[PDB]
Amino acid sequence: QPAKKTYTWNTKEEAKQAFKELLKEKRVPSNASWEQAMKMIINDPRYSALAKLSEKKQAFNAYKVQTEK
């Protein structure tokens, strides 16, 4: 196809994993707002790892709690 490469997810852990790993690669800070983290991660196809934005936010919030303390 005329474009970049797309990722594919089948298990909730894999999709949630790409979203969390997506924030890690985006260096999202633990104090980033869903807007800053979501945009920095949406630019990446990993954002498609989650079909619901509510789960996308839970993974982002969990991502900050995993890179804090």
From Swiss-Prot:
Residue stretches making up the FF domain: 12-66
Leader sequence residues: none
Localization per Swiss-Prot or TrEMBL: Nucleus speckle; Nucleus matrix
Tissue: Expressed in the brain cortex (at protein level). Widely expressed.
Role according to the record: Binds to WASL/N-WASP and suppresses its translocation from the nucleus to the cytoplasm, thereby inhibiting its cytoplasmic function. Plays a role in the regulation of cell morphology and cytoskeletal organization. Required in the control of cell shape and migration. May play a role in cytokinesis. May be involved in pre-mRNA splicing.
Family note: Belongs to the PRPF40 family.
Subunit structure: Interacts with the N-terminus of HTT. Interacts with the phosphorylated C-terminal domain of POLR2A. Interacts with AKAP8L, SF1, SRPK1, ENAH, ATBF1 and MECP2. Interacts through the WW domains with formin proline-rich regions and with WASL/N-WASP.
Domain writeup: The WW domains are essential for localization to nuclear speckles.
Protein name as it appears in the record: Pre-mRNA-processing factor 40 homolog A
